[PDB]
Amino acid sequence: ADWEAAMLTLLMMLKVIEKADNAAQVLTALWFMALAAHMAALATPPKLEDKSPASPEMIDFRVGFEELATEIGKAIKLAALGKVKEAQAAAEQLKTTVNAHWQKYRSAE
Amino acid sequence: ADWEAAMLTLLMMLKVIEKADNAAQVLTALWFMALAAHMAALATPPKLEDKSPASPEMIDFRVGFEELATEIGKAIKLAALGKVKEAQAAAEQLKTTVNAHWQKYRSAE
Amino acid sequence: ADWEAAMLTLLMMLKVIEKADNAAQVLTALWFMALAAHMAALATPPKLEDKSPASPEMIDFRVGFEELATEIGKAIKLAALGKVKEAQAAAEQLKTTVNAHWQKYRSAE
């Protein structure tokens, strides 16, 4: 999967977490968010198509994706510990990380 | 997971996509198809057990698996865009790619 | 995801397999167990924080995680073949592998 398909996966799974009821649904959705990021970890946004891999603008995209996967992992642990509301609260703070990362590298759509 | 277990996962998830109702179920099943392929990306079919990795018959299996993951990624994006029928139509064309790849490297079962 | 979050994912998915009804639910949960292990394949338990990577105590943790992913893959194939009870029986023997691996490297909690 390319970049902007995994970003829409993240956004949609965040909507599943809000409408969740138990720890299984949120943990499942969170793992899908972790899954999507790893399959698209090596993907490239449409903006940074012709940018060099060693460019400061591209590596700043790589650390932001690594940061995104780091907040996902922390929310996964809270859901794995049976704390549904402590994780859903972390998924809300995660949403502002997915959103900021998305429009910064979106194709202006 | 070995090769023919992930191929049965693909086949079963295609059946889930036909019986889906919303974008969440098809996107989830599609990501499972992408998941299965990556975990079995380095797997080897029972036929090509003793074939050399640089053999033309083996590399042709590798590019076909890469092609399979490429059609999955495209169907994932259509489901991520909320187009359930545009993606289910792509999952049907994907089914003929999973089927052709399966029996070509199946253990004649 | 770190180590003890993926181990709780494994434990919770085993509980989903017991409460499953069809091949889709068990195969899905099993793939989540395979997923969790690959994302945490390079993770480090809290005990082995300061141990060297070439230490016998650390490599013994690596082969045990590889063994864990091997039993998961075999249970995935049984669920992929439509054998729900043959796989749920394998998931029960898998549970004693997840449990033994968990408390051996748990942070004494």
Ligand SMILES: [Mn+2]
């Ligand atoms: Mn990987």
